[PDB]
Design a protein around this ligand. Structure first.
Ligand SMILES: O=C(O)C[C@H]1C=CC(=O)O1
Ligand SMILES: O=C(O)C[C@H]1C=CC(=O)O1
Ligand SMILES: [Mg+2]
Ligand SMILES: [Mg+2]
Lengths: 366, 366
């Protein structure tokens, strides 16, 4: 189980319809397929989604850091030296998805080598997660229609509404429309992606005080430090930190500082080894945690469910596992299937997925 | 890899010489051998040391809780459902070593099943740890002689001196004698086992301010809450919490409250699954951590080194891995070997140990 090579292949798949939010937009999945090759002939895989508006990474930069720094530093390590890999990669600051992809690809290879799923190796608490769908910006009536279509089609009963627009009433009207349309049959929460000021955020939440929102996520910039802390202290529900807590150290600083009261865990940025560190820190401190979506393709979604199903604290909440549906196509030989509002972790070893050679050849851009 | 049975066998092995400290004494290793049997014929093992003066557990109580509560709740789970086992056992409060033994025995069985050492499955950062020896109470000249004998014989260069006696000068004279005898060639720190008041502790440490002590461990009772917090804030070096932080929740309360500035990790009380939670919490918060000794036999010591070698934060410090040497005998087919002041993690699968049938038959007390 020795790593003999690590590759990073850029690919691009168009979205049937773009996902729009406060901090940016995604019109195509211009990701990087990361592969870890072992001396047993096993190939572990994962993807790295460049999100310049979130971590500052670019598709070109991800391939570069992996080919120029991480690959040469990790070749030669066995799949059971994760902490050595973790420590070596840590010598380089940032580059979250690049690091995470390598770690998850390593876990995929390990699982295949041992004939064990990543989920069970991580803890195997359960075998499925409830699904939450992120609704991107669009005309009010159009967002409601999207939710209705999605719930009827896939059985999804949890929706995270993207907000952060002006006037604030535009978004609060959307949320109210959703609650009037579905009643208490669905769970609802919001993510502003740093779009509103803390003052606008409070007014928006006060206006939606009767809509039973489960969480408020990054309503205003965490970097508007003092007003952010004041806002978090004014809200009843937990305030989920996402882009502001990419590392365990950030979780500690933001939570102890009062700028976060709940933690988003995204395998795209902390992989499995790092995500375990975040989960244990959040559980130890006593904070709610939710599996988030990095606008993942099916490869990243398979990773999210693999980790989310391994622990009780992550599976007690619905996981954001459905945005891959807006992609026009994907790289798996067998597409992920959501039914009854749930997604099961794959039964196969490792991530339980396989890359379709023809799909890769068609969408790669190198 | 399904658990078909879990047994708890009490055994007793006399000590060549008793280990004495502030909170109690150990004249024999009256432990409990815990075994997890799988449907593959594999048997994982570990030990549970009853420490009434530390956790309140008794040899009889450990066997009882395992046979009456844990065994029936875990039979039927696979070795890759650790989080289910963790959650089920958590329904019962306390009983730390009983829970830890079951978890470590499960990891031992898993490793054997996969032909992987526990150390590598946990992270595989390194393959050995430096050794630290705990010096129990005794006449000053006798404690110094013990340190000299131990250093020359095993190459051990780190010593944790047991203190907490009155007058305080009795212990400070011991530490000073050790520093004068070995100079800067050895590392020294102290553990008072809640023996001194906070006021006595400060005076003792001030008297030893020139002896370069690396840590101060449980000098006074953590339950003397306010004076304990005042003391911790008065000391330069990290203050290791041990018996006061048996769980991650305690780590959070004591650290945020200011009654602890460093954390002791003992596999005897948090096993591997639980110890990982403590390590990640301590790393996330930014606190030093040291692998402690629960006055472990060789079985427990094999567990300590297995976990300690898996991470960088635990292996950067010497681990307390030598007190088993005072036992008159032990249960392993192949005794642990300390040389050049180090202990390597065993090369074999799981814990890399095997119980000698004749030793078990001779020392069991059921
Ligand atoms: O923020 C989210 O939860 C969803 C998405 C928006 C940007 C991004 O990278 O993640
Ligand atoms: O306190 C220590 O570090 C050593 C030992 C003393 C009692 C016990 O259970 O552990
Ligand atoms: Mg978000
Ligand atoms: Mg101690």
């Amino acid at each position: 189980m020795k790593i003999v090579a690590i590759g990073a292949i850029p690919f691009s798949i168009p979205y049937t319809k773009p996902l729009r939010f406060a901090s940016g937009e995604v019109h195509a999945a211009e990701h990087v397929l990361v592969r870890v090759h072992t001396d047993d002939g096993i190939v572990g895989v994962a993807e790295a989604p460049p999100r310049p508006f979130t971590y500052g990474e670019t598709q070109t930069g991800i391939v570069a850091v992996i080919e120029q720094y991480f690959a040469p530093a990790l070749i030669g390590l066995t799949l059971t030296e994760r902490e050595v890999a973790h420590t070596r990669m840590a010598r380089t600051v940032g580059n979250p998805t690049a690091k995470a992809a390598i770690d998850m690809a390593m876990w995929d290879a390990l699982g295949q080598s041992l004939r064990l799923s990543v989920s069970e190796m991580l803890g195997g608490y359960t075998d499925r997660m409830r699904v939450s769908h992120m609704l991107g910006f669009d005309d009010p009536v159009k967002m409601v229609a999207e939710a209705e279509r999605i719930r009827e089609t896939y059985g999804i009963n949890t929706f995270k509404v993207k907000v952060g627009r002006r006037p604030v009433q535009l978004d609060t009207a959307v949320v109210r429309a959703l609650r009037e349309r579905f009643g208490d049959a669905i769970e609802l929460y919001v993510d502003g992606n740093r779009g509103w000021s803390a003052a606008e955020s409070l007014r928006a939440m006060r206006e939606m005080a009767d809509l039973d929102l489960l969480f408020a996520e990054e309503l205003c910039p965490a970097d508007d430090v003092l007003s952010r802390r004041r806002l978090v202290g004014q809200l009843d529900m937990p305030f989920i930190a996402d882009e502001s807590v990419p590392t365990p150290a950030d979780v500690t600083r933001e939570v102890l500082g009062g700028s976060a009261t709940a933690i988003s865990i995204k395998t795209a940025r902390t992989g499995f080894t790092g995500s375990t560190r975040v989960h244990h820190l959040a559980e130890g401190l006593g904070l709610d945690m939710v599996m988030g979506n990095q606008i993942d393709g099916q490869i990243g979604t398979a990773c999210t469910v693999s980790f989310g199903t391994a622990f009780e604290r992550t599976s007690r909440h619905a996981g954001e596992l459905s945005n891959f549906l807006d992609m026009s196509d994907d790289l798996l030989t067998v597409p992920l299937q959501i039914s009854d509002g749930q997604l099961h972790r794959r039964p196969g070893p490792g991530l339980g997925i396989e890359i379709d050679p023809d799909k890769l050849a068609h969408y790669r851009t190198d």
